[PDB]
Design an enzyme around this catalytic site. Structure first.
Site, PDB file in Angstrom:
ATOM      1  N   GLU A  35      49.399  33.681  46.969  1.00  0.00           N
ATOM      2  CA  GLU A  35      48.695  34.202  48.120  1.00  0.00           C
ATOM      3  C   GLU A  35      48.481  33.025  49.082  1.00  0.00           C
ATOM      4  OE1 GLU A  35      44.558  34.902  47.508  1.00  0.00           O
ATOM      5  OE2 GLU A  35      44.415  36.302  49.207  1.00  0.00           O
ATOM      6  N   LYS A  46      45.669  43.716  50.964  1.00  0.00           N
ATOM      7  CA  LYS A  46      44.525  43.375  50.108  1.00  0.00           C
ATOM      8  C   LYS A  46      43.283  44.238  50.396  1.00  0.00           C
ATOM      9  CE  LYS A  46      42.201  39.221  48.218  1.00  0.00           C
ATOM     10  NZ  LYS A  46      41.845  37.810  48.506  1.00  0.00           N
ATOM     11  N   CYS A 102      44.734  38.293  44.155  1.00  0.00           N
ATOM     12  CA  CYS A 102      43.515  37.511  43.892  1.00  0.00           C
ATOM     13  C   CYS A 102      42.252  38.269  43.434  1.00  0.00           C
ATOM     14  CB  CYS A 102      43.326  36.684  45.147  1.00  0.00           C
ATOM     15  SG  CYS A 102      42.405  35.202  44.706  1.00  0.00           S
TER      16      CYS A 102
END
Ligand SMILES: *[C@@H]1O[C@H](CO)[C@@H](O[C@@H]2O[C@H](CO)[C@@H](O[C@@H]3O[C@H](CO[C@@H]4O[C@H](CO)[C@@H](O)[C@H](O[C@@H]5O[C@H](CO)[C@@H](O)[C@H](O)[C@@H]5O)[C@@H]4O)[C@@H](O)[C@H](O[C@@H]4O[C@H](CO)[C@@H](O)[C@H](O)[C@@H]4O)[C@@H]3O)[C@H](O)[C@H]2NC(C)=O)[C@H](O)[C@H]1NC(C)=O
Ligand SMILES: *[C@@H]1O[C@H](CO)[C@@H](O[C@@H]2O[C@H](CO)[C@@H](O[C@@H]3O[C@H](CO)[C@@H](O)[C@H](O)[C@@H]3O)[C@H](O)[C@H]2NC(C)=O)[C@H](O)[C@H]1NC(C)=O
Ligand SMILES: N#C[C@@H]1CCCN(C(=O)c2cnc(NC3(c4cncnc4)CC3)nc2)C1
Ligand SMILES: *[C@@H]1O[C@H](CO)[C@@H](O)[C@H](O)[C@H]1NC(C)=O
Ligand SMILES: *[C@@H]1O[C@H](CO)[C@@H](O)[C@H](O)[C@H]1NC(C)=O
Ligand code: NA
EC number: 3.5.1.92
Length: 461
Positions: A57, A156, A189
């Site tokens: 990322e 995300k 993440c």
């Protein structure tokens, strides 16, 4: 059926920063400097027989931005259904050099490429949720197949504190891509700490493997990247490809390839400023069938230790109820509210000036994010001083001959962590029982930093 998986830990070239937003030419020049490094990893991975490679990322432009300083780095990433090979039809959607480069990298090396870039979606003052900027900006993972085609686009969902340069999608995006080497799910993440899309991909979409681009800040004793990511893979019974940013200064390190039974390859390095390419084989269709009831054993048995010297200890801003381990062998039970933790252990020796405790936590985490936790932990206290239990400890000398950990978890999402000195994983030294017990199979190969059962109550968030 097996396949060779690859992950790359990336020492990224960050933009000079900041004051006035850069020009597209300046933003692209930087992105290309990072892309040349990732090109190096994609070519070796493919030369070594890998079917897929995950890159981290923010690997292409970093994590230091505001909405305006980020804008010049962004591309309009089309809906993957659009059926597009950017390497073969370079100007279908206007100026898209990063997508073209990533597409050519996947095509020319005949490998799947997972990367994390930025998406731009211009919107109108007509739609209510449109920013006053006139565009949506998303932290986006892109997947290009072995022929160079865009097969996945993921924005995300769970933005972390200070990710003010990005927007959260309206509805969670449950993104999968199917291959000749299994069904793949994807998230990024902080997503690993939430239900959507993370849990949904595994329990409802029945994916075989998760591809995970990450820029993770390590937080011992429970939230070190290699530790938690392999725990999550084991708890969810899935393959897991974790590709992390290499920045020891921000405690960013910890990439690996994980299977449902154990870790397969991992990398932790706080010393050098260098990246690391990892490769390992995995089963295309692992067995997902190994069901665990996490409260079973614990809720059946009666308290292993009576009238004990208990104290409050802080773990990552959370107040755990501890009980010191007195003796080279023992049986302890410690409770905090709705959670009761049981531990049975026998150490290899009684090492001087090394204190271990059994902790219990039932409550909500609020520092830099909100999530309900239920945690049972065997942790090495940083020093002899009991008020240092739960503080990050990186080294230990106590090997254990045996351990068995369990709790009265009010959840089915429990992640089993085993971490050795100095952030080393223990494959395949422990196993989880259908009863909900985390236990050793052999004496530990190195000293123990922690043995945790990391529980998650998504409804109480
Ligand atoms: C994502 O892609 C995957 C991979 O392509 C898709 O999964 C495939 O779906 C096909 C259609 O349903 C399946 O085909 C049927 O197979 C059976 C035979 O059983 C299989 O035998 C295979 C060879 O030995 C084996 O690979 C396969 O998978 C395994 O299943 C077991 C459990 O049974 C599991 O333990 C393994 O881990 C693995 O998953 C099976 O054992 C045929 O009998 C069947 O009949 C035929 O129907 C055809 C019409 O479709 C017709 O042409 C023919 O005449 C027969 O009537 C099918 O051929 C295929 O097994 C399956 N592949 C795998 C690896 O799972 C998946 O559907 C895609 N997902 C999405 C969301 O798109
Ligand atoms: C995992 O194992 C535990 C332990 O067996 C399961 O929890 C238990 O679930 C049963 C229902 O099957 C509960 O029984 C009920 O008890 C109440 C009184 O408390 C009674 O009124 C009902 O008639 C019924 O007998 C039991 O209390 C409950 N125990 C705990 C600690 O929650 C759990 O559901 C299992 N999960 C799976 C999916 O296997
Ligand atoms: N810096 C930077 C990153 C840039 C990308 C966006 N980030 C994250 O999503 C992110 C979230 N969490 C972490 N690490 C943990 C944490 C650390 N400290 C407080 N709360 C949790 C341990 C979970 N690491 C990265 C932060
Ligand atoms: C991929 O190959 C084509 C021709 O084979 C070439 O035009 C393109 O520049 C290459 N791209 C990369 C990044 O290797
Ligand atoms: C701990 O419990 C186990 C199982 O009940 C028992 O065999 C062992 O002797 C106990 N050890 C101590 C020191 O209490
Ligand atoms: Na920011």
């Amino acid at each position: 059926d097996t396949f060779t998986a690859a992950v790359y830990e990336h020492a990224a070239i960050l933009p000079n920063a900041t004051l006035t937003p850069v020009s597209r030419e300046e933003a692209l020049a930087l992105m290309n400097r990072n892309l040349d490094i990732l090109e190096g990893a994609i070519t070796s991975a493919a030369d070594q027989g890998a079917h897929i490679i995950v890159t981290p990322e923010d690997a292409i432009y970093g994590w230091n931005f505001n909405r305006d300083s980020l804008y010049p780095y962004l591309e309009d990433i089309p809906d993957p259904e659009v059926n597009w090979i950017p390497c073969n039809n370079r100007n279908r959607f206007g100026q898209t050099p990063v997508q073209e480069r990533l597409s050519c990298l996947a095509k020319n090396n005949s490998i799947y490429v997972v990367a994390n870039i930025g998406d731009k979606k211009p919107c109108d003052t007509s739609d209510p949720q449109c920013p006053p900027d006139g565009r949506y900006q998303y932290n986006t993972d892109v997947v290009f197949d072995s022929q160079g085609k865009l097969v996945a686009r993921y924005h995300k969902q769970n933005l972390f504190m200070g990710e003010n340069q990005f927007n959260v999608p309206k509805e969670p995006e449950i993104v999968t891509f199917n291959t000749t080497f299994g069904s793949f799910g994807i998230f990024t993440c902080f997503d690993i700490l939430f239900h959507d899309p993370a849990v949904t991909l595994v329990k409802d979409f029945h994916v075989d493997t998760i591809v995970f681009p990450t820029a993770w800040m390590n937080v011992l004793p429970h939230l070190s990247a290699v530790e938690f990511h392999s725990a999550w893979a084991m708890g969810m019974r899935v393959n897991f490809l974790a590709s992390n940013i290499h920045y020891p200064s921000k405690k960013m390190t910890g990439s690996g390839i994980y299977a449902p039974n154990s870790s397969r390859a991992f990398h932790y390095d706080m010393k050098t400023e260098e990246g690391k390419l990892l490769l390992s084989q995995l089963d295309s269709h692992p067995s997902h069938s190994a069901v665990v009831n996490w409260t079973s054993y614990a809720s059946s048995i009666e308290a292993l230790s009576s009238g004990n010297k208990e104290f409050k200890g802080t773990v990552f801003f959370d107040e755990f109820t501890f009980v010191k381990l007195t003796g080279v062998a023992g049986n302890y039970t410690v409770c905090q509210k709705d959670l009761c933790c049981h531990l049975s252990y026998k150490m290899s020796e009684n090492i001087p000036n090394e204190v271990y405790a059994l902790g219990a936590f039932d409550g909500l985490h609020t520092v830099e994010g909100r999530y309900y936790l239920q945690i049972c932990t065997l942790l090495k206290c940083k020093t002899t001083n009991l008020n240092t239990c739960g503080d990050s400890a990186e080294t230990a000398s106590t090997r254990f001959e045996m351990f068995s950990l369990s709790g009265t978890f009010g959840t089915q999402y429990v992640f089993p962590e085993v971490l050795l000195s100095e952030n080393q994983l223990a494959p395949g030294e422990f196993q989880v029982s259908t009863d909900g017990r985390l236990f050793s199979l052999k004496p530990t190969s190195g000293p123990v930093l922690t043995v945790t059962l990391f529980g998650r109550l998504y409804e109480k968030d």
